[PDB]
Enzyme design. Structure first.
Site, PDB file in Angstrom:
ATOM      1  N   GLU A   1      -5.591 -10.992  -0.803  1.00  0.00           N
ATOM      2  CA  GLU A   1      -6.434 -10.901   0.383  1.00  0.00           C
ATOM      3  C   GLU A   1      -7.926 -10.828   0.045  1.00  0.00           C
ATOM      4  OE1 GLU A   1      -4.855  -7.649   2.753  1.00  0.00           O
ATOM      5  OE2 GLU A   1      -2.927  -7.835   1.706  1.00  0.00           O
TER       6      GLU A   1
ATOM      7  N   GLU B   1       0.763  -1.244   0.000  1.00  0.00           N
ATOM      8  CA  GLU B   1       0.000   0.000   0.000  1.00  0.00           C
ATOM      9  C   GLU B   1       0.803   1.309   0.000  1.00  0.00           C
ATOM     10  OE1 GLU B   1      -2.581  -0.578   3.332  1.00  0.00           O
ATOM     11  OE2 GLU B   1      -3.381  -2.454   2.530  1.00  0.00           O
TER      12      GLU B   1
HETATM   13  O1  LIG Z   1      -2.315  -6.859   6.062  1.00  0.00           O
HETATM   14  C1  LIG Z   1      -3.647  -6.704   5.612  1.00  0.00           C
HETATM   15  C2  LIG Z   1      -3.737  -5.416   4.829  1.00  0.00           C
HETATM   16  O2  LIG Z   1      -2.901  -5.424   3.682  1.00  0.00           O
HETATM   17  C3  LIG Z   1      -5.191  -5.039   4.511  1.00  0.00           C
HETATM   18  N1  LIG Z   1      -5.329  -3.758   3.727  1.00  0.00           N
HETATM   19  C4  LIG Z   1      -6.803  -3.343   3.384  1.00  0.00           C
HETATM   20  C5  LIG Z   1      -7.120  -1.983   3.851  1.00  0.00           C
HETATM   21  C6  LIG Z   1      -6.223  -0.924   3.665  1.00  0.00           C
HETATM   22  C7  LIG Z   1      -6.538   0.401   4.112  1.00  0.00           C
HETATM   23  C8  LIG Z   1      -7.770   0.634   4.739  1.00  0.00           C
HETATM   24  O3  LIG Z   1      -8.102   1.998   5.187  1.00  0.00           O
HETATM   25  C9  LIG Z   1      -8.112   2.519   6.559  1.00  0.00           C
HETATM   26  C10 LIG Z   1      -7.119   2.179   7.462  1.00  0.00           C
HETATM   27  C11 LIG Z   1      -7.148   2.710   8.811  1.00  0.00           C
HETATM   28  C12 LIG Z   1      -8.177   3.558   9.169  1.00  0.00           C
HETATM   29  C13 LIG Z   1      -9.195   3.910   8.254  1.00  0.00           C
HETATM   30  C14 LIG Z   1      -9.145   3.384   6.952  1.00  0.00           C
HETATM   31  C15 LIG Z   1      -8.675  -0.403   4.935  1.00  0.00           C
HETATM   32  C16 LIG Z   1      -8.346  -1.713   4.485  1.00  0.00           C
HETATM   33  C17 LIG Z   1      -6.051  -5.152   5.782  1.00  0.00           C
HETATM   34  C18 LIG Z   1      -5.825  -6.365   6.411  1.00  0.00           C
HETATM   35  C19 LIG Z   1      -4.585  -6.686   6.812  1.00  0.00           C
HETATM   36  O4  LIG Z   1      -4.583  -7.963   7.451  1.00  0.00           O
END
Ligand SMILES: O[C@@H]1[C@@H](O)[C@H](NCc2ccc(Oc3ccccc3)cc2)C=C[C@H]1O
EC number: 3.2.1.8
Length: 331
Positions: A240, A133
């Site tokens: 994922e 990301e």
């Molecule tokens: O390691 C994985 C990860 O890659 C995944 N990204 C998906 C994702 C990325 C950003 C996101 O956005 C936010 C993050 C924090 C707070 C608000 C939004 C939401 C889901 C999530 C699960 C984990 O187990």
């Protein structure tokens, strides 16, 4: 193991079928996992904070158990995130005065971390998510503002891939991300990997997280992303995959089970998706679900704390849902 065919076996000539696991499910769901998955990814137990909590202290117990489990059963293992703005301990970005670490420190620390983590499983992990990301969701922003970009530098991705490639030159190095189908972000992820390959960086694959839902992205949107990323001559992994029954910033919270509407849309949704994957099995070499069965999913607590979800093809009792039968591969 009962009456249902192995999901992974149904795709043995198409692509791996994997699941995110945690050591706690191995002694209870180990058989189910070994039956349906020929690939596993540690959901969290291999992230920076989980294996390198303190600068001079590595805690590989959990990750080692997951690897022993898989490797002894011919099950492949994907290494998840070496470089990511989340789940990374603060000490990595700080100096002795609590201030910010310098570039030189970032580099030596990233080198040691990669060599230790990637080197530990040298030849045992077929694929590593080197960087996770790094691209922004903001329309007018390409690179996500992270401590890696700020303290290490704009070449932190090139750096990461090179170090990982040296720690284990046989493992496939992936760049992983979400919202990979959104036209705007898609082109950003495309130009990133493109620029990396052009610089000579050892990037061999793009990881499409697949954190989708029963309402989107559409078949055409996924199709274009696939063909677009594939045109880079790199492998594609769905890393994922999950189909939430809720939309973004969903206001519904009184559900103990999916509604009839949700169950129907998810069933048809999964069918179309894997139908699409099979069509592009030449480009897709691995499809991992971010979880085993509905009895547990990171979505149960994100983005809404304590809101149950059911994004898989197996239900809370590890029984195949209607979507499972519509996803069985043709081998
Ligand atoms: O390691 C994985 C990860 O890659 C995944 N990204 C998906 C994702 C990325 C950003 C996101 O956005 C936010 C993050 C924090 C707070 C608000 C939004 C939401 C889901 C999530 C699960 C984990 O187990």
């Amino acid at each position: 193991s009962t009456e249902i065919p192995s999901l992974s076996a149904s795709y043995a000539n198409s692509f791996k079928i994997g699941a995110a696991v945690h050591t706690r499910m191995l002694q209870t769901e180990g058989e189910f996992i070994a039956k349906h998955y020929n690939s596993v990814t540690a959901e969290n137990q291999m992230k920076f904070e989980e294996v390198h909590p303190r600068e001079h202290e590595y805690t590989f117990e959990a990750a080692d158990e997951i690897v022993d489990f898989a490797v002894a059963r011919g099950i492949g293992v994907r290494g998840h995130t070496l470089v990511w703005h989340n789940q990374t301990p603060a000490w990595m970005f700080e100096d002795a005065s609590g201030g910010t670490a310098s570039r030189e420190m970032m580099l030596s620390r990233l080198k040691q971390h990669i060599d230790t983590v990637v080197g530990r499983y040298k030849d045992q992990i077929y694929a590593w998510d080197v960087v996770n990301e790094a691209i922004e969701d903001k329309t007018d922003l390409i690179m996500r503002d992270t401590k890696w970009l700020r303290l290490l530098g704009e070449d932190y991705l090139v750096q990461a891939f090179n170090m990982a490639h040296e720690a284990d030159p046989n493992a496939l190095l992936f760049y992983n991300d979400y919202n990979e189908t959104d036209p705007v972000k898609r082109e950003k992820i495309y130009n990133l990997v493109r620029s990396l390959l052009d610089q000579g960086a050892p990037v061999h694959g793009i990881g499409m997280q697949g954190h989708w839902n029963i309402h989107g992205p559409s078949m055409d949107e996924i199709r274009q992303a696939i063909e677009r990323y594939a045109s880079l001559d790199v492998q594609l992994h769905v890393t994922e995959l999950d189909l939430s029954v809720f939309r973004h910033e969903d206001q519904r919270t009184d559900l103990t089970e999916p509604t009839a509407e949700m169950a129907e849309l998810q069933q048809k949704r999964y069918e179309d998706i894997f139908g699409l994957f099979r069509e592009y099995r030449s480009n897709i070499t691995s499809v991992t679900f971010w979880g085993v069965a509905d009895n547990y999913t990171w979505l149960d607590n994100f983005p809404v704390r304590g809101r149950k979800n059911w994004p898989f093809v197996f239900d809370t009792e590890l029984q195949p849902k209607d979507s499972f039968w519509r996803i069985i591969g043709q081998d």
